Design an enzyme around this catalytic site. Structure first.
Site, short mmCIF file in Angstrom:
data_model
loop_
_atom_site.label_atom_id
_atom_site.label_comp_id
_atom_site.label_asym_id
_atom_site.label_seq_id
_atom_site.Cartn_x
_atom_site.Cartn_y
_atom_site.Cartn_z
CB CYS A 33 4.65 15.86 -19.89
SG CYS A 33 4.84 14.68 -21.24
CB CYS A 47 2.76 16.20 -24.59
SG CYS A 47 1.85 16.19 -23.04
CG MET A 67 3.37 -2.23 16.16
SD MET A 67 4.84 -1.42 16.83
CE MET A 67 4.85 0.04 15.77
CD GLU A 68 -1.34 -1.49 12.87
OE1 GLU A 68 -1.88 -0.58 13.53
OE2 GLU A 68 -0.35 -1.31 12.12
CD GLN A 118 -2.32 -1.39 2.89
OE1 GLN A 118 -3.04 -2.37 3.15
NE2 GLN A 118 -1.98 -0.48 3.82
CB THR A 124 -1.73 -3.70 7.45
OG1 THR A 124 -3.14 -3.65 7.24
CG2 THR A 124 -1.15 -4.65 6.45
CG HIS A 126 -2.31 2.61 -2.54
ND1 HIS A 126 -2.28 2.37 -1.18
CD2 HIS A 126 -3.49 2.12 -2.98
CE1 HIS A 126 -3.40 1.78 -0.81
NE2 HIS A 126 -4.15 1.61 -1.88
ZN LIG Z 1 2.62 14.33 -21.85
#
Ligand SMILES: [Zn+2]
Ligand code: NA
EC number: 2.3.1.-
Length: 266
Positions: free
Chosen positions: A171, A176, A240-241, A104, A214, A122
Site C-alpha cells: 500500500c 502504512c 442457458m442453464e 456476481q 443465472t 463480489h
Molecule cells: Zn495501507
C-alpha cells in the site's frame, strides 16, 4: 413463458430496471472460472486459493493466481449481452429512466462495455485492499508489481515464485506500507453491507428485474430476485442453464445471453 412481446410491453413501461448478472455472462466472454472439473490452475481449483486461509498461508501463490487472472482479461472482451445492457442503460438515462447492474462477476466486463451504475457485490480483480489500513484502491497495472512480472503460469509443473512478502504489492501510503490483497470476496467472507443496503434501495425502487446468466433460485441471485418478485414485479431470466421446466420464473428465455438479451432490450 417465452412470449417476448409480453416481456417487451413491460420493458416499455418500466422506469427502474435492475439487472442481476451471474457467471453465464462472463462465461460467454471466455473467462475461466476454475470451478468445473477441468478448471484447474496449476494443481489447484479456486476453492483452494480464494480463501483468507490460503492468503494468510501463502500470499505469493494466491497473488500469482490473481495476477494470472488479471492478465487473461486483456484478451477476453465484453460479449453482446454486456453491450446490450450498457447501451440500454445509456439510452434509457437520456429518457430519465434508470438501469442498474448487480453483478456476481469480478472481471469488470460491464465496466468495459460502458455500463456505469454497476454494483460489484463480489468486488473486483482490479481493486486492492490494504491488509493494514483497509484502503480500497483501483488498480489495472500490468504487472501489478515488478516482482510478479511473468509469473502465474497455469501448467501444473510451473515453479512457485515464492515472492518474499515485502515485494508483493504494498500500500503506497508510506505511513502504512501495508500488504495488499485483491478486493474480491473469497469463500467464507460476507458481503459488504454498505453495498447490500444500496442494492436493497435499488431493488425496492425497481419495477422490472432481469436475471442474466443465472437463475433466480440459486445463491446468490436468490437474495435479490425472489424479493422483487414477491412484490409482484415481473422477473425475466436469460440463461442457458437449461433450468428444468418446473421452476423457471415469470418469463424465461433459454439460450446464450449474447443472442437472447440484445433483441430483448433494443
Ligand atoms: Zn495501507
Ligand atoms: Na465499505
Amino acid at each position: 413463458s417465452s412470449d417476448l412481446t409480453a416481456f417487451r410491453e413491460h420493458f416499455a413501461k418500466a422506469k427502474h430496471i435492475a439487472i442481476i448478472t451471474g457467471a453465464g455472462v462472463s462465461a460467454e466472454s471466455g473467462v475461466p472460472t476454475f470451478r468445473g472439473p477441468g478448471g484447474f490452475w496449476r494443481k489447484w481449483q479456486a476453492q483452494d486459493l480464494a480463501t483468507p486461509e490460503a492468503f494468510s498461508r501463502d500470499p505469493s501463490l494466491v497473488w500469482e493466481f490473481y495476477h494470472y487472472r488479471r492478465e487473461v482479461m486483456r484478451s477476453k472482451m465484453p460479449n453482446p449481452a454486456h453491450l446490450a445492457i450498457a447501451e440500454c442503460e445509456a439510452r434509457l438515462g437520456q429518457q430519465g429512466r434508470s438501469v442498474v447492474i448487480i453483478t456476481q462477476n469480478i472481471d469488470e466486463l460491464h465496466h468495459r462495455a460502458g455500463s456505469k451504475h454497476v454494483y460489484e457485490i463480489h468486488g473486483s480483480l482490479f481493486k486492492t485492499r490494504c491488509m493494514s489500513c483497509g484502503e480500497v484502491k483501483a488498480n489495472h497495472k500490468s504487472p501489478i508489481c515488478p516482482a510478479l512480472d511473468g509469473k502465474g503460469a497455469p501448467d501444473p509443473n510451473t515453479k512457485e515464485a515464492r515472492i518474499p512478502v515485502e515485494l508483493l504489492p504494498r500500500c503506497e501510503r508510506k505511513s502504512c506500507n501495508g500488504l495488499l490483497r485483491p478486493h474480491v470476496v473469497w469463500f467464507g467472507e460476507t458481503l459488504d453491507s454498505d453495498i447490500l443496503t444500496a442494492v436493497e434501495r435499488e431493488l425496492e425502487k425497481c419495477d422490472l428485474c432481469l436475471v442474466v446468466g443465472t437463475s433466480s433460485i440459486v445463491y446468490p441471485a436468490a437474495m435479490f430476485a425472489p424479493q422483487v418478485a414477491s412484490r409482484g414485479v415481473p422477473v425475466a431470466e436469460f440463461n442457458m442453464e437449461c433450468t428444468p421446466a418446473t421452476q423457471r420464473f415469470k418469463y424465461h428465455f433459454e439460450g446464450p445471453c449474447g443472442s437472447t438479451l440484445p433483441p430483448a432490450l433494443e
